[PDB]
Write a protein that binds this ligand. Structure first.
Ligand SMILES: [Cl-]
Ligand SMILES: [Cl-]
Ligand SMILES: [Zn+2]
Ligand SMILES: [Zn+2]
Ligand SMILES: [Zn+2]
Lengths: 240, 196, 217, 218
């Protein structure tokens, strides 16, 4: 239905960016919103039909374009730290009065790109005391020292992505809570029967997709350019 | 304006989550409930247009245009339902949303066996985490008081194949003083917590 | 200490032309981490140095892609594709692999341009300075090229010596010209004994000396 | 806006000490290392040492060990360089230079931002503020004569920095009295001498001299 690209974006203060939005339900009405913790959904701009654009509640710093009915891009003129937010596109028929939202775009605007750090990922193997006591085995995955908070953590068992027996923290922790450009930490758990963990043929992987810089970005640091990448840690089953 | 019931609601598994919403525009004709998981997008779960109840699975939306009131009840609540619920009101084919209401559905832990286990990194035994697990939903975990100690909130996993649910929190630290026995010292832990 | 040597130490170049500055070190500069900390700094006249190229060949953001660096072992080069007027200044190669960090002697890039004659101006002393008992007469030669210029002071047609000082600015980043200021210092009592104060200028751009003068004293 | 603002010029007798301060802005101070580089008149560059304001880690050039002390004050984002037992060949502009590497990155070995320098003269002569005299005016030339000061430098600006095109500020000349003297000139449209006001802002920090001089046609 409603599509949004990119899913995540890190911007440097002053840069321009266009968040793409496209629906295929032949809807006349399209809108953009930003979602912030203390004040929910705030309408930025909206389009009642092809060629018609109108300011919403918070239009300052943004432009919208509506040449065709399918697409409605949101242009950030000159990125500012106050534009760090989650952006949502939404399509409504405008003729059924129901509105459908896009997947969202997590955007972080930083004063400089030297703040962006990819996560370090580690898998912590189940405890023998847990195994004997409960007959279950919990693997823990930790993603640490990442900035911005634009990460997707998945668990993979024997090459297949798994969802059962897993729970990842809904929000990451701040390593330095007093700081604004603090790096983050995220944990996840995957519980399995003791018998499943005890089979050495079973392979467990914790995969963290991080979104950062592009290969085109300039970089002066000795450390590797913190590009968009997957960082993963693994553990094999063990009869012990 | 659209106003919703405040703060996070804590609902035990099996019970009814009760969501309220009052709107200012008396000429409003369309009313909606959206569900939003953390880090995900708002998803339309219910629509109501005329006075009365409207049911769909475990959801029951109620409308009373006279008292400018919309409600959503989530029957037989499951930890799956933990999300933010947004109310949206309109007049004709802008949509006005409320701030939302966070709903937390705590699982029914019938057989708790609280314990704090120590898990070592698959690549390095020097590195470890502390896992507080198998406690019932009546125990809350307090955030880290120390700057170099990291504690995550309780999180519910569901081993769907066995119909088994369990709570757990994770703590870790580079401090030479850090031990799993002192890791959750700021929380009100059950007296019978197993410390292997 | 690692000795850093540059060649040439002075480099005259016409805009549009390429330029190369060589830098040689007494030891190799590959650190134990594998990186080679050899850099190029440009210090424009009256300003702090500015980083151009870091770690042999990497250009610092904002530096025009007309600048590039290469090299290995003990031999390193900085290349300017097409030299621009704004590239005047002193280029230093620097070593950061081993402590203490060391710099080269510096290479003054001088830009060659067409001959420009100076605009000559004279200034009698102010009345406030005369009240203090001294008289400074200033002769300004504005935006000329080359740097070589002769300024002669004449009081009542008598050629002066030992009572004047002068300084020239560095080459201009926009038009590549030099400027010169010369002061003649007399006591107020001596100033008041003469009528004609003149500064006579000779330069390649002038086919005949130019005399700027005023009457009074 | 990253900025490194250093303390003003000073004259110190031989044998005395000097402490140059360098205040940081527009970035997290403890995140980058601060190097000190000196430049004597008409000479090249000499690295002196560095301080990591995060952990107080310092590095030094052996040539200044026993005389140089590098400290920091994270509360006021300032790095200090103190040089003791001052000699004549210590007369130089002293710069603080920021290492390019953030949060312990090795790029600290090369410098991205520099302060404006602090001119230090080693001499047993006395500080003297300058006198400022006008050099009254298709184009007209006007200026200011900043005479009889010690030690160097003096800064000069026109109309508080609003006039920069056509401005030539000449290198100072050491007079036979041991006092410097310099001029600052500007060429402007001759058809503006009655309309636009021309003021030169002279600053001699060593003697806390701040003069604004109106230059008008005779
Ligand atoms: Cl006169
Ligand atoms: Cl030097
Ligand atoms: Zn005479
Ligand atoms: Zn005479
Ligand atoms: Zn030593």
């Amino acid at each position: 239905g409603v599509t949004q690209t990119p899913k995540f974006q890190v911007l440097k203060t002053g840069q321009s960016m266009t968040l793409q939005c496209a629906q295929d339900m032949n809807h006349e009405y399209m809108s953009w919103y930003r979602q912030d913790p203390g004040m929910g959904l705030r309408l930025i701009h909206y389009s009642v039909g092809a060629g018609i654009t109108d300011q919403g509640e918070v239009p300052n710093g943004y432009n919208v374009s509506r040449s065709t009915t399918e697409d409605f891009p949101l242009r950030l003129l000159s990125a500012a730290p106050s534009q760090t937010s989650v952006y949502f596109c939404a399509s409504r028929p405008g003729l059924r009065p129901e509105q459908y939202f896009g997947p969202g775009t997590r955007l972080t605007v930083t004063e400089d790109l030297k703040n962006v750090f990819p996560p370090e990922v580690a898998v912590f193997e189940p405890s023998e005391a847990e195994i004997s006591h409960t007959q279950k085995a919990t693997l823990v995955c930790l993603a640490t020292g990442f900035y911005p908070d634009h990460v997707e953590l998945s668990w993979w068992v024997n090459g297949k992505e798994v969802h059962s027996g897993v729970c990842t923290d809904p929000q990451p922790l701040k390593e330095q809570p007093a700081l604004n450009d603090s790096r983050y930490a995220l944990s996840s758990r995957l519980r399995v029967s003791a018998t499943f963990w005890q089979d050495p043929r079973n392979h467990f992987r914790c995969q963290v997709q991080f979104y950062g810089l592009s290969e085109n970005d300039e970089w002066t640091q000795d450390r590797a350019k913190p590009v968009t990448q997957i960082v993963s840690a693994e553990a094999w089953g063990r009869a012990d | 304006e659209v106003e919703q019931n405040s703060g996070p609601l804590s609902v035990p598994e099996g019970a009814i989550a009760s969501l309220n919403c009052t709107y200012s525009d008396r000429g409003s004709q369309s009313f909606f409930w959206y569900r939003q998981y953390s880090g995900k997008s708002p998803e339309l779960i219910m629509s109501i247009y005329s006075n009365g109840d409207k049911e769909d699975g475990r959801f029951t939306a109620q409308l009373n245009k006279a008292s400018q009131y919309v409600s959503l009840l989530i029957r037989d609540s499951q930890p799956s339902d933990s999300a933010t619920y947004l109310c949206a009101v309109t007049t004709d084919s802008k949509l006005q949303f409320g701030a939302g209401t966070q709903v937390v559905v705590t699982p029914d832990i019938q057989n708790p066996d609280p314990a704090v286990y120590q898990l070592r990194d698959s690549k390095s035994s020097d590195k470890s985490v502390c896992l507080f697990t198998d406690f019932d939903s009546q125990t809350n975990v307090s955030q880290s008081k120390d700057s170099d100690v990291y504690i995550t909130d309780k999180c519910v996993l569901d081993m769907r194949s066995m119909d088994f649910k369990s709570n757990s929190a994770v703590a870790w630290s580079n401090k030479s003083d850090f031990a799993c026995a002192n890791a959750f010292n700021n929380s009100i832990i059950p007296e019978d917590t197993f410390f292997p | 200490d690692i000795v850093m040597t540059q060649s040439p130490l002075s480099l005259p170049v016409t805009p549009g032309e390429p330029a190369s500055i060589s830098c040689r070190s007494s030891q190799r500069l590959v650190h134990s981490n594998g990186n080679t900390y050899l850099h190029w700094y440009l210090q424009k006249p009256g300003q702090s140095p500015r980083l151009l190229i870091y770690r042999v060949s990497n250009r610092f953001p904002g530096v025009p892609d007309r600048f590039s660096g290469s090299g290995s072992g003990t031999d390193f080069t900085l290349k300017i594709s097409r030299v621009e007027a704004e590239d005047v200044g002193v280029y230093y190669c620097s070593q950061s692999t081993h402590v203490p960090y060391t710099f080269g002697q510096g290479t003054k890039l001088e830009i060659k341009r067409t001959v420009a004659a100076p605009s000559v101006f004279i200034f009698p002393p102010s009345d406030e300075q005369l009240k203090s008992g001294t008289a400074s007469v200033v002769c300004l030669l504005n935006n000329f090229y080359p740097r070589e210029a002769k300024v002669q002071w004449k009081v009542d047609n008598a050629l002066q010596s030992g009572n004047s000082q002068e300084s020239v600015t560095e080459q201009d980043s926009k038009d590549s010209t030099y400027s010169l200021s010369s002061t003649l210092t007399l006591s107020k009592a001596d100033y008041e004994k003469h009528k004609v104060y003149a500064c006579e200028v000779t330069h390649q751009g002038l086919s005949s000396p130019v005399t700027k003068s005023f009457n009074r004293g | 806006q990253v900025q490194l603002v250093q303390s003003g010029a000073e004259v110190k007798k031989p044998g005395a000490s000097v402490k140059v301060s360098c205040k940081a802005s527009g970035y997290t101070f403890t995140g980058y290392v601060m190097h000190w580089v000196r430049q004597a008149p008409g000479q090249g560059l000499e690295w002196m040492g560095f301080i990591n304001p995060y952990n107080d880690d310092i590095q030094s050039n052996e040539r200044f060990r026993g005389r140089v002390t590098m400290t920091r004050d994270t509360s006021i984002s300032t790095a200090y360089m103190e040089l003791s037992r001052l000699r004549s060949d210590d007369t130089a502009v002293y710069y603080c230079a920021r290492g390019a590497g953030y949060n312990f990155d090795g790029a600290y070995r090369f410098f991205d931002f520099w302060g404006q320098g602090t001119m230090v003269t080693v001499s047993s002569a006395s500080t003297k503020g300058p006198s400022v005299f006008p050099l009254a005016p298709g184009t007209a030339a006007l200026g200011c004569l900043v005479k009889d000061y010690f030690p160097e430098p003096v800064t000069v600006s026109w109309n508080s920095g609003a006039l920069t095109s056509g401005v030539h500020t000449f290198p100072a000349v050491l007079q036979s009295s041991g006092l410097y003297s310099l001029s600052s000139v500007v060429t402007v449209p001759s058809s503006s001498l009655g309309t636009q006001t021309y003021i030169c802002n002279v600053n001699h920090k060593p003697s806390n001299t701040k003069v604004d001089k109106k230059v008008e046609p005779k």
